[PDB]
Amino acid sequence: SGFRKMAFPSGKVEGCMVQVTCGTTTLNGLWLDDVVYCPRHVICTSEDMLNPNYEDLLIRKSNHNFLVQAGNVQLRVIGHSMQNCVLKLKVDTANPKTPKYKFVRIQPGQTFSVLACYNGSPSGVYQCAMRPNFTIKGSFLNGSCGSVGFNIDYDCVSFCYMHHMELPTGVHAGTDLEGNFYGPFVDRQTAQAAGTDTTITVNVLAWLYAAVINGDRWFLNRFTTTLNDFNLVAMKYNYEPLTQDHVDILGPLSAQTGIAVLDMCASLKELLQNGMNGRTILGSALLEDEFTPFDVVRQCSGVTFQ
Amino acid sequence: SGFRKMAFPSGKVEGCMVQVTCGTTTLNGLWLDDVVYCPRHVICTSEDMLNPNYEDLLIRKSNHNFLVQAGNVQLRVIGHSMQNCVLKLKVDTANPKTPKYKFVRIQPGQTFSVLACYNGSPSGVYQCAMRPNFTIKGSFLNGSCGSVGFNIDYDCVSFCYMHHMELPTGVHAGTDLEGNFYGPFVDRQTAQAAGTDTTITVNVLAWLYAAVINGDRWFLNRFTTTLNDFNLVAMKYNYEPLTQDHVDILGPLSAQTGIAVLDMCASLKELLQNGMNGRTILGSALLEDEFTPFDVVRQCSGVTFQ
Ligand SMILES: *[C@](O)(C(=O)N1CC(C)(C)C1)[C@H](C[C@@H]1CCCNC1=O)NC(=O)[C@@H]1[C@@H]2[C@H](CN1C(=O)[C@@H](NC(=O)C(F)(F)F)C(C)(C)C)C2(C)C
Ligand SMILES: *[C@](O)(C(=O)N1CC(C)(C)C1)[C@H](C[C@@H]1CCCNC1=O)NC(=O)[C@@H]1[C@@H]2[C@H](CN1C(=O)[C@@H](NC(=O)C(F)(F)F)C(C)(C)C)C2(C)C
């Protein structure tokens, strides 16, 4: 039993992390095959980052201007290009520990593990959700840029996130590994703020299923509701609409517990209107929206990776 | 910025996990050098586990009775002994990926990462505290036994926990890697329950410091208090006493924020007496006691491992 926020094991990703230095700027890079991927603002100074011309700064760099270091070894750059906000450095050595991997662009609502790195060395690992406003709520300091988020599927790492920047309210923004930002953020030290965020409804329901599985059932009421009705009540508590696709995705949890999605929707509608009344669910005093249905099944069935 | 529950990167431990099968029982083992360590109840059936004579069952086993498997490879056992509740299987092969490591017995209050495994393969990683009643609040299913908890210090893994059992209320109990249980639990399917738990005061204060560092300061009041007074108020909310050692351990956080431990103690005493009043700290609606002072510094300074 028990229900924890739980990240994917990081080992496959650890063996891909490098330090990338250009001038005085040092940040982390991802070494896959014979390419190092990092944020393009590695080629900036403090001055530069207020309004940088990245194509211009990069013109003026030679391969030797990029120190890439993998513990004790220093990799020699033999090529450099820019794809959107990502810099690609061709190195002379293929990473022997490159895992099976893919590049994905995740959807708002989806979770992943972040491997927080400083100076190309791992600090720690935690789980995050891509919020509906295209931010994440991470823990990142100076030097963390180039840290990556990932999902593991059996043996194959899907990289979906690279860390670039921090926004007001101390939430975080970044790119896919093709260098396209999630959301409307630019890699420029300029005033930018996140849109107001919503609660990911399907994830809250997934967490309610996890609660029931773990025996926490005080909140199950005896009513049903319609999808239509549920959505109207949830509209006012700033919950995203639940679509029929979402209902279908909750099918496994519904089936494993014998609670129709719409009975659970009934129970949540009550919690939103009456609040939690001095009671916790799975240890928590707030409703959690950072567990997907797959995460719950993963944790409550025992899905495993190598 | 930001503050997350964050585990140590798991890679060094991943390369030590094996599947250990004896008869129909399969659970996880830890392969260090040429020894596999696992819970001794691998040698039991369902029948057995109500009241097992472990010395007796083990007498009757040959080395060949132990299948040890490391992905595709099968290791040949060439020796077996029992140390307390841990079984030690000498294998014919040393693990090439054995990291620098130590065996530690942690103290109540201390945190570690758990690498949850099924069939000797990692499912995921999360952070836990050894609670004062010598339990942890994990996520563990059937097959998880032998999963280990660890701290990383630079390059050296300190294993402190191996998973054995689950108790009423769905909390968890286990041994150090020398096979001594934490707390008064026995490895026997018998009615056993955890003592009522306390809140780890020093950890709550460490979390308050993290809050301030992250800018969440609404709860700082303008008073001091004495250690004596603080402890009396905390006695009734089921907080452990704060000793002078604890005060000394909070020194770095106190120094980095310029808030005396006893000013912070003043602020906590208020929160305990007046409650949180519909407000969160670092996202949380409850006070958190599962971050040590070292964890906070680690996360808020950027300590890093390889
Ligand atoms: C990242 O670039 C990094 O780790 N380093 C750059 C140096 C060499 C200093 C180390 C850095 C990570 C953030 C730093 C503050 C704490 N948390 C972080 O995640 N990213 C940046 O500093 C980032 C780069 C320029 C400005 N950045 C940035 O994040 C700004 N944010 C904004 O301007 C905002 F619009 F609010 F998003 C702050 C420094 C936080 C003000 C660029 C975006 C290119
Ligand atoms: C662990 O032994 C394991 O993963 N497996 C044994 C098999 C082969 C079935 C796979 C197992 C882990 C727990 C299983 C329930 C869910 N969570 C777990 O962590 N441990 C046990 O089953 C454990 C062994 C016998 C009885 N165990 C146990 O945990 C009991 N608990 C108690 O008796 C209690 F006193 F409450 F602690 C339950 C099965 C949960 C009732 C032994 C203790 C040797």
XYZ file of C-alpha atoms and ligand atoms in Angstrom:
700
model
C 0.000 0.000 0.000
C 0.748 3.672 0.184
C 0.820 6.368 -2.408
C 3.831 8.528 -3.059
C 4.909 11.061 -5.626
C 7.523 8.929 -7.281
C 9.938 9.602 -10.117
C 11.328 7.297 -12.747
C 14.746 5.817 -11.888
C 17.308 8.259 -13.265
C 20.258 5.986 -14.156
C 19.663 5.966 -17.927
C 19.678 9.759 -17.917
C 22.549 10.215 -15.452
C 24.962 8.667 -17.977
C 23.990 11.356 -20.543
C 24.635 14.509 -18.479
C 27.592 16.731 -19.329
C 28.904 20.140 -18.347
C 28.874 22.669 -21.188
C 30.972 25.832 -20.717
C 31.187 28.756 -23.114
C 33.257 31.685 -21.871
C 32.210 32.037 -18.245
C 28.748 30.508 -18.718
C 28.404 26.932 -17.505
C 25.248 24.875 -17.848
C 24.260 21.259 -18.325
C 24.003 19.372 -21.585
C 22.557 16.071 -22.730
C 24.968 13.768 -24.544
C 23.169 11.347 -26.858
C 25.171 9.453 -29.447
C 27.650 12.090 -30.637
C 25.453 15.152 -30.069
C 25.328 17.367 -26.979
C 22.051 19.281 -26.628
C 21.887 22.375 -24.441
C 20.029 25.712 -24.047
C 21.338 28.220 -26.587
C 21.812 30.925 -23.936
C 25.072 29.148 -23.016
C 26.649 31.561 -25.580
C 25.484 34.702 -23.655
C 26.964 36.855 -20.882
C 24.805 38.660 -18.244
C 24.708 41.721 -20.531
C 23.586 39.612 -23.478
C 20.584 37.987 -21.864
C 18.418 41.133 -21.702
C 17.952 41.137 -25.495
C 20.340 38.638 -27.203
C 20.810 38.103 -30.926
C 21.551 34.381 -30.754
C 22.256 33.888 -34.479
C 24.761 36.722 -34.184
C 26.577 35.510 -31.029
C 26.843 31.971 -32.501
C 28.321 33.172 -35.811
C 31.224 34.463 -33.716
C 31.932 31.155 -31.991
C 34.410 28.475 -33.040
C 34.046 24.842 -31.974
C 36.910 25.352 -29.486
C 34.851 28.011 -27.676
C 32.741 25.164 -26.244
C 34.230 23.182 -23.412
C 32.273 19.953 -22.991
C 33.251 17.848 -20.034
C 31.995 14.422 -18.879
C 33.487 13.872 -15.456
C 37.238 13.603 -16.039
C 37.015 13.476 -19.834
C 36.734 16.516 -22.061
C 34.874 15.955 -25.338
C 36.092 17.864 -28.384
C 33.328 19.714 -30.252
C 33.554 19.228 -34.033
C 30.342 20.958 -35.102
C 27.626 23.297 -33.820
C 24.201 24.275 -35.035
C 21.150 25.869 -33.525
C 17.659 24.402 -33.700
C 15.211 26.938 -32.255
C 16.265 27.509 -28.619
C 18.492 24.414 -28.431
C 22.124 24.284 -29.351
C 23.463 21.068 -30.910
C 27.180 20.378 -30.511
C 28.574 17.545 -32.588
C 31.318 15.887 -30.559
C 34.117 13.560 -31.669
C 32.982 10.759 -29.323
C 29.656 8.913 -29.171
C 28.327 8.515 -25.609
C 28.795 4.798 -24.777
C 25.906 5.006 -22.278
C 23.376 6.475 -24.746
C 20.124 4.604 -23.883
C 17.291 3.807 -26.280
C 15.538 7.132 -26.471
C 13.010 9.312 -28.260
C 12.149 13.033 -28.279
C 8.516 13.799 -27.382
C 6.508 16.994 -26.988
C 4.141 16.386 -24.065
C 0.629 17.759 -23.637
C -0.582 19.946 -20.745
C -1.659 17.527 -18.048
C 1.146 14.998 -18.595
C 3.796 14.311 -15.937
C 7.496 13.521 -16.170
C 10.586 13.119 -13.988
C 13.105 15.987 -13.803
C 16.741 15.169 -13.146
C 18.047 18.386 -11.581
C 21.715 18.935 -12.528
C 24.461 21.407 -11.609
C 27.752 21.479 -13.562
C 26.636 18.415 -15.504
C 26.257 16.395 -12.264
C 22.858 15.154 -10.917
C 21.545 16.811 -7.736
C 18.303 14.830 -7.481
C 15.130 13.627 -9.143
C 11.455 14.488 -8.726
C 8.136 14.234 -10.624
C 6.408 17.252 -12.286
C 3.320 17.929 -14.371
C 3.218 20.209 -17.398
C 0.592 22.653 -16.049
C -2.158 23.982 -18.395
C -0.383 27.361 -18.644
C 2.726 25.554 -19.977
C 4.813 25.968 -16.837
C 6.093 23.412 -14.317
C 6.561 23.757 -10.560
C 10.150 22.652 -10.158
C 13.090 23.249 -7.859
C 15.819 24.860 -9.949
C 18.670 27.189 -9.021
C 21.377 28.903 -11.017
C 23.312 26.337 -13.014
C 20.263 24.029 -13.430
C 19.620 25.030 -17.075
C 19.868 22.104 -19.476
C 18.419 19.744 -16.852
C 15.978 17.477 -18.600
C 12.626 15.887 -17.902
C 11.848 12.374 -19.112
C 9.506 9.400 -19.073
C 10.702 5.814 -19.148
C 8.839 3.187 -21.143
C 10.407 -0.186 -20.349
C 13.928 0.487 -21.726
C 13.284 3.613 -23.796
C 13.711 7.174 -22.451
C 11.332 9.774 -23.868
C 12.915 13.153 -23.259
C 10.202 15.821 -23.295
C 11.620 18.852 -21.397
C 14.790 20.921 -21.127
C 15.068 23.648 -18.478
C 15.646 27.256 -19.565
C 14.023 29.834 -17.269
C 12.147 30.861 -14.166
C 9.052 33.081 -14.118
C 7.321 35.311 -11.488
C 5.779 33.217 -8.736
C 8.837 30.947 -9.076
C 7.428 28.553 -11.682
C 9.536 27.322 -14.568
C 9.555 27.188 -18.338
C 11.495 25.303 -20.957
C 11.594 23.596 -24.298
C 11.118 20.215 -25.903
C 14.423 18.722 -27.110
C 13.803 20.287 -30.546
C 14.092 23.700 -28.898
C 10.451 24.797 -29.072
C 9.211 26.426 -25.879
C 6.222 25.018 -24.126
C 3.805 27.941 -23.949
C 4.457 31.501 -25.232
C 7.799 32.097 -23.435
C 10.938 33.490 -25.145
C 14.546 32.961 -23.972
C 15.146 36.599 -23.208
C 15.436 38.322 -19.797
C 12.246 40.354 -20.279
C 9.068 40.683 -18.178
C 7.020 37.571 -18.879
C 4.402 35.974 -16.666
C 2.482 32.685 -16.736
C -1.252 32.671 -17.533
C -3.454 31.807 -14.542
C -3.400 28.048 -14.133
C -6.274 25.524 -13.932
C -6.649 22.253 -12.037
C -6.241 19.153 -14.207
C -9.572 17.437 -13.524
C -8.790 13.975 -14.914
C -5.664 13.858 -12.719
C -7.646 14.787 -9.625
C -10.065 11.951 -10.333
C -7.096 9.574 -10.904
C -5.829 10.564 -7.454
C -9.287 9.914 -5.942
C -9.148 6.401 -7.459
C -5.699 5.914 -5.877
C -7.203 7.009 -2.546
C -9.955 4.374 -2.781
C -7.444 1.688 -3.746
C -5.431 2.686 -0.666
C -8.606 2.354 1.478
C -9.335 6.132 1.957
C -13.048 6.112 1.078
C -14.708 8.643 3.436
C -15.507 10.924 0.475
C -17.414 8.414 -1.683
C -21.039 9.583 -1.747
C -23.883 7.458 -3.070
C -24.886 9.651 -6.048
C -24.154 9.732 -9.774
C -24.005 12.868 -11.945
C -23.888 13.594 -15.657
C -20.737 14.709 -17.438
C -22.638 17.844 -18.431
C -23.576 18.722 -14.820
C -20.145 17.850 -13.461
C -18.435 20.171 -15.945
C -20.667 23.155 -15.023
C -19.917 22.851 -11.296
C -16.182 22.374 -12.019
C -16.138 25.410 -14.340
C -16.443 27.708 -11.317
C -13.666 26.073 -9.273
C -11.243 26.628 -12.173
C -11.126 22.933 -13.167
C -10.510 22.040 -16.817
C -13.504 20.409 -18.595
C -13.585 16.627 -18.468
C -13.978 15.251 -22.007
C -15.205 11.784 -22.990
C -11.590 10.909 -23.840
C -10.751 11.611 -20.182
C -13.607 9.362 -19.019
C -12.251 6.617 -21.304
C -8.726 7.026 -19.911
C -10.038 6.537 -16.369
C -11.609 3.215 -17.488
C -8.900 0.932 -15.916
C -9.145 2.628 -12.533
C -12.946 2.602 -12.742
C -12.872 -1.098 -13.614
C -10.323 -2.007 -10.934
C -12.392 -0.278 -8.168
C -15.914 -0.829 -9.448
C -16.677 2.904 -9.247
C -18.046 4.467 -12.401
C -16.197 7.608 -13.394
C -19.496 9.518 -12.918
C -19.978 8.271 -9.357
C -16.458 9.491 -8.634
C -17.338 12.733 -10.429
C -20.327 13.004 -8.054
C -17.968 12.589 -5.054
C -15.554 15.237 -6.337
C -18.343 17.760 -7.056
C -19.359 17.382 -3.406
C -15.749 17.929 -2.212
C -15.488 21.085 -4.336
C -18.717 22.526 -2.941
C -18.442 21.425 0.706
C -14.605 21.431 0.943
C -12.606 18.778 2.834
C -13.947 19.696 6.311
C -10.733 19.181 8.324
C -10.012 15.820 6.652
C -7.144 14.538 4.510
C -7.102 12.256 1.478
C -3.959 10.131 1.098
C -2.207 12.335 3.661
C -3.118 15.469 1.684
C -5.335 18.340 2.858
C -5.657 19.675 -0.711
C -6.773 17.899 -3.904
C -3.751 16.803 -5.980
C -3.683 17.156 -9.753
C -0.112 16.057 -10.540
C -0.818 12.326 -10.889
C -2.031 11.094 -14.278
C -4.194 7.953 -14.542
C -1.164 6.119 -15.940
C 0.913 7.246 -12.919
C -1.702 5.876 -10.559
C -1.901 2.532 -12.380
C 1.926 2.430 -12.634
C 2.200 2.896 -8.882
C -0.831 0.776 -7.876
C -0.101 -2.175 -10.275
C 3.742 -2.129 -10.148
C 4.962 -1.177 -13.635
C 8.729 -1.458 -13.831
C 11.605 -0.341 -16.081
C 14.967 -1.565 -17.412
C 13.577 28.760 -6.760
C 10.991 26.235 -5.751
C 10.996 23.492 -3.209
C 10.286 19.894 -4.051
C 10.491 16.561 -2.316
C 13.420 15.230 -4.257
C 15.239 11.912 -4.169
C 18.859 11.088 -4.789
C 19.621 9.957 -8.360
C 19.191 6.184 -8.365
C 21.705 5.044 -11.019
C 24.359 3.779 -8.584
C 21.737 1.614 -6.902
C 19.955 0.477 -10.075
C 23.084 -1.436 -11.145
C 22.967 -3.445 -7.872
C 19.381 -4.760 -8.028
C 18.765 -8.445 -8.697
C 15.847 -10.851 -8.637
C 16.135 -13.541 -5.963
C 13.835 -16.577 -6.303
C 13.557 -19.462 -3.866
C 10.863 -22.002 -4.703
C 7.912 -19.857 -5.736
C 8.944 -16.810 -3.687
C 10.506 -13.995 -5.690
C 11.842 -10.801 -4.166
C 14.575 -8.275 -4.821
C 18.185 -8.482 -3.736
C 21.131 -6.118 -3.565
C 24.271 -7.283 -5.352
C 27.411 -5.699 -3.908
C 30.782 -7.161 -4.804
C 30.075 -10.904 -4.763
C 27.325 -10.877 -2.123
C 23.571 -10.669 -2.696
C 21.657 -9.341 0.320
C 17.939 -10.010 0.652
C 15.161 -10.451 3.266
C 15.387 -13.918 4.810
C 11.672 -14.599 4.262
C 12.579 -15.424 0.638
C 12.916 -19.033 1.961
C 9.248 -19.155 3.171
C 5.931 -20.161 1.590
C 2.570 -18.519 2.532
C 2.088 -21.217 5.196
C 5.537 -20.562 6.633
C 5.188 -16.843 7.193
C 2.676 -17.068 10.066
C 5.342 -18.446 12.431
C 8.539 -19.435 10.516
C 11.624 -21.121 11.933
C 14.145 -19.437 9.644
C 17.229 -21.309 10.912
C 15.324 -24.518 10.228
C 14.088 -23.669 6.696
C 17.612 -22.497 5.709
C 19.309 -25.681 6.959
C 17.221 -27.481 4.336
C 18.340 -25.315 1.425
C 21.199 -25.968 -0.988
C 22.904 -23.172 -2.924
C 21.068 -24.325 -6.079
C 17.722 -23.608 -4.382
C 18.440 -19.891 -4.911
C 17.934 -18.523 -8.380
C 19.655 -15.147 -8.649
C 19.090 -13.300 -11.874
C 20.495 -9.966 -13.125
C 18.578 -9.151 -16.273
C 19.572 -11.846 -18.769
C 22.355 -13.318 -16.634
C 21.824 -15.851 -13.880
C 24.365 -15.715 -11.045
C 25.359 -19.005 -9.433
C 25.132 -18.988 -5.625
C 28.200 -20.558 -3.982
C 27.437 -19.807 -0.334
C 24.622 -18.690 1.972
C 24.461 -17.428 5.514
C 21.960 -15.556 7.605
C 22.734 -12.390 9.544
C 19.693 -11.499 11.660
C 16.804 -10.923 9.214
C 19.037 -10.615 6.133
C 20.165 -13.457 3.965
C 23.640 -13.248 2.401
C 24.218 -15.240 -0.785
C 27.806 -15.519 -1.940
C 27.782 -15.561 -5.734
C 30.475 -16.664 -8.186
C 30.607 -13.236 -9.882
C 31.424 -9.824 -8.406
C 29.008 -7.086 -9.539
C 31.025 -4.921 -11.983
C 28.790 -1.928 -11.158
C 29.280 -2.124 -7.367
C 29.613 1.571 -6.335
C 31.585 2.906 -3.379
C 29.245 2.137 -0.534
C 28.759 1.839 3.211
C 26.116 0.307 5.503
C 24.566 2.778 7.968
C 21.870 2.521 10.626
C 19.949 5.808 10.485
C 18.328 7.640 13.387
C 14.622 8.525 13.685
C 14.246 11.852 11.932
C 16.675 11.112 9.083
C 15.520 10.864 5.454
C 16.619 8.657 2.574
C 15.655 7.731 -0.987
C 13.807 4.444 -1.608
C 14.280 2.696 -4.930
C 11.076 0.664 -5.264
C 11.759 -2.603 -7.140
C 9.682 -5.493 -8.493
C 11.374 -8.677 -9.773
C 14.763 -7.032 -9.305
C 13.795 -4.171 -11.672
C 13.331 -0.518 -10.513
C 9.773 0.868 -10.533
C 10.618 4.346 -9.233
C 12.307 6.476 -6.609
C 11.032 8.707 -3.814
C 12.220 10.291 -0.534
C 11.148 9.023 2.945
C 11.854 9.834 6.576
C 12.439 7.252 9.289
C 9.512 8.276 11.542
C 9.990 8.367 15.363
C 8.022 5.108 15.737
C 10.548 3.395 13.414
C 8.231 3.125 10.423
C 8.322 4.824 7.014
C 5.441 5.986 4.822
C 6.290 4.320 1.541
C 4.537 2.981 -1.529
C 5.209 -0.753 -1.644
C 3.234 -3.630 -3.142
C 3.765 -7.367 -3.245
C 7.168 -8.134 -4.712
C 8.740 -4.903 -3.337
C 10.593 -6.661 -0.478
C 14.358 -6.241 -0.680
C 13.955 -2.724 -2.102
C 16.516 -0.532 -0.432
C 16.763 2.997 0.885
C 19.971 4.992 0.518
C 21.751 8.317 0.843
C 24.403 9.500 -1.578
C 27.450 11.387 -0.352
C 29.372 12.581 -3.409
C 30.261 9.153 -4.893
C 29.521 6.892 -1.925
C 26.145 5.172 -1.357
C 25.119 4.699 2.269
C 22.517 1.957 2.321
C 20.419 2.294 5.478
C 17.117 0.440 4.803
C 15.827 -2.803 3.313
C 12.077 -3.363 2.917
C 10.427 -6.301 4.698
C 6.835 -5.622 5.786
C 3.707 -3.524 5.929
C 1.819 -2.631 9.113
C -1.784 -1.530 9.945
C -2.472 1.958 8.640
C -0.344 0.988 5.615
C 3.027 2.157 6.948
C 6.164 0.112 6.431
C 8.960 -1.512 8.376
C 12.339 -2.949 7.544
C 15.920 -3.541 8.497
C 19.353 -2.006 8.184
C 21.592 -3.976 5.794
C 22.910 -5.977 8.777
C 19.405 -7.381 9.215
C 18.393 -5.572 12.408
C 14.853 -4.216 12.316
C 14.255 -0.568 12.889
C 11.860 -0.486 15.835
C 10.392 -3.535 17.647
C 9.042 -5.376 14.558
C 9.634 -9.099 13.848
C 9.536 -10.762 10.398
C 6.541 -12.904 11.187
C 2.938 -12.559 9.924
C 1.550 -11.731 13.378
C -0.515 -8.785 14.678
C 1.921 -5.915 15.127
C 1.164 -2.210 15.104
C 3.281 0.955 15.045
C 3.473 3.182 18.141
C 1.696 6.532 17.731
C 4.002 8.817 15.791
C 5.299 12.325 16.613
C 6.158 15.293 14.404
C 9.894 15.805 13.886
C 10.240 19.385 15.139
C 13.706 20.194 13.774
C 12.540 19.087 10.307
C 9.476 21.310 10.486
C 11.687 24.276 11.329
C 14.045 23.325 8.445
C 11.023 23.432 6.133
C 10.026 26.863 7.510
C 13.552 28.089 6.651
C 13.113 26.695 3.115
C 9.816 28.600 2.900
C 11.514 31.893 3.818
C 14.320 31.258 1.333
C 11.635 30.679 -1.311
C 9.996 34.017 -0.332
C 6.971 32.584 1.625
C 7.228 34.763 4.747
C 3.619 35.523 5.806
C 4.084 33.450 8.985
C 7.162 35.229 10.382
C 6.023 37.036 13.537
C 8.140 39.615 15.332
C 8.656 37.726 18.626
C 11.347 35.507 20.131
C 10.754 32.648 22.590
C 12.925 30.493 24.817
C 13.761 26.888 24.013
C 12.111 25.971 27.309
C 8.820 27.733 26.441
C 8.807 26.472 22.865
C 9.164 22.859 24.008
C 6.212 23.113 26.449
C 3.830 24.437 23.781
C 5.067 21.809 21.278
C 4.640 19.012 23.848
C 0.858 19.267 23.477
C 0.811 19.197 19.662
C 2.758 15.912 19.726
C 6.031 17.489 18.521
C 9.326 15.939 19.633
C 11.413 18.137 22.000
C 13.922 20.402 20.298
C 17.366 19.873 21.857
C 20.334 22.253 21.711
C 21.923 19.877 19.184
C 18.906 20.535 16.940
C 19.326 24.306 17.358
C 22.998 23.910 16.380
C 22.086 21.869 13.292
C 19.748 24.638 12.117
C 22.678 27.112 12.356
C 23.409 27.245 8.552
C 19.790 27.963 7.676
C 19.561 30.507 10.499
C 22.745 32.171 9.257
C 21.718 32.129 5.590
C 18.328 33.811 6.365
C 19.258 35.981 9.328
C 16.459 34.473 11.437
C 17.498 33.116 14.805
C 16.235 29.608 15.418
C 14.233 31.010 18.380
C 12.492 33.645 16.263
C 11.499 30.846 13.899
C 10.457 28.805 16.942
C 8.257 31.775 17.933
C 6.640 31.726 14.452
C 5.984 27.980 14.594
C 4.468 28.146 18.106
C 2.008 30.696 16.711
C 1.152 28.428 13.731
C 0.524 25.502 16.093
C -1.806 27.533 18.304
C -3.631 29.602 15.663
C -3.405 27.057 12.789
C -2.722 28.035 9.158
C -5.986 29.994 8.669
C -6.737 28.971 5.058
C -3.146 29.638 3.933
C -0.427 27.430 2.450
C 3.323 27.344 3.022
C 5.390 26.215 0.022
C 2.216 24.900 -1.618
C 1.376 22.860 1.495
C -1.678 23.280 3.739
C -0.075 21.146 6.478
C 3.321 21.497 8.191
C 5.880 19.107 6.647
C 8.346 17.171 8.776
C 10.042 14.981 6.146
C 12.791 17.435 5.170
C 15.942 17.457 7.301
C 18.073 20.618 7.587
C 20.655 18.947 5.343
C 17.931 18.224 2.743
C 16.912 21.864 2.741
C 20.502 23.090 2.361
C 21.154 20.394 -0.291
C 18.173 21.619 -2.287
C 18.598 25.367 -1.602
C 22.429 25.469 -2.162
C 22.707 22.849 -4.963
C 24.676 19.905 -3.545
C 25.404 17.379 -6.264
C 26.545 13.753 -6.621
C 28.694 11.535 -8.865
C 19.822 29.097 -16.365
O 20.205 29.857 -17.509
C 21.033 28.776 -15.513
O 20.956 27.833 -14.753
N 22.095 29.579 -15.538
C 22.458 30.774 -16.327
C 23.662 30.965 -15.362
C 25.028 30.902 -16.031
C 23.549 32.190 -14.461
C 23.307 29.617 -14.695
C 18.902 29.932 -15.443
C 18.026 29.173 -14.435
C 17.205 30.104 -13.530
C 18.064 31.085 -12.712
C 17.279 31.739 -11.594
C 16.773 30.661 -10.662
N 16.109 29.588 -11.401
C 16.269 29.275 -12.686
O 15.668 28.313 -13.201
N 18.051 30.692 -16.346
C 18.117 32.013 -16.469
O 18.760 32.741 -15.712
C 17.273 32.530 -17.624
C 18.079 32.951 -18.850
C 17.929 34.438 -19.031
C 17.112 34.957 -17.874
N 16.624 33.748 -17.193
C 15.693 33.665 -16.243
O 15.254 32.590 -15.864
C 15.165 34.982 -15.676
N 13.726 34.939 -15.893
C 13.090 35.814 -16.654
O 13.574 36.719 -17.295
C 11.582 35.619 -16.699
F 11.073 36.293 -17.703
F 11.006 35.924 -15.539
F 11.295 34.349 -16.902
C 15.544 35.286 -14.200
C 17.062 35.267 -14.041
C 14.947 34.298 -13.190
C 15.031 36.703 -13.907
C 17.324 33.490 -20.039
C 15.816 33.426 -20.128
C 18.001 33.331 -21.385
C 7.300 -8.798 0.818
O 7.637 -10.006 1.495
C 7.038 -9.069 -0.650
O 7.136 -8.139 -1.423
N 6.613 -10.270 -1.038
C 6.391 -11.553 -0.341
C 5.694 -12.061 -1.634
C 6.360 -13.267 -2.283
C 4.192 -12.277 -1.487
C 6.109 -10.750 -2.340
C 5.968 -8.225 1.357
C 5.678 -6.739 1.105
C 4.301 -6.297 1.626
C 3.129 -7.082 1.012
C 1.795 -6.412 1.269
C 1.818 -5.032 0.650
N 3.018 -4.295 1.041
C 4.171 -4.802 1.474
O 5.141 -4.070 1.750
N 6.002 -8.475 2.790
C 5.186 -9.328 3.400
O 4.208 -9.847 2.860
C 5.569 -9.557 4.854
C 6.241 -10.901 5.122
C 5.329 -11.725 5.990
C 4.057 -10.939 6.189
N 4.352 -9.609 5.633
C 3.632 -8.495 5.755
O 4.056 -7.411 5.385
C 2.262 -8.627 6.419
N 2.297 -7.707 7.547
C 2.172 -8.106 8.802
O 2.057 -9.242 9.202
C 2.181 -6.975 9.818
F 2.383 -7.457 11.022
F 1.080 -6.232 9.747
F 3.173 -6.145 9.565
C 1.034 -8.400 5.493
C 1.092 -9.366 4.313
C 0.929 -6.975 4.938
C -0.206 -8.722 6.339
C 6.642 -11.219 6.539
C 6.592 -10.182 7.639
C 7.787 -12.198 6.704
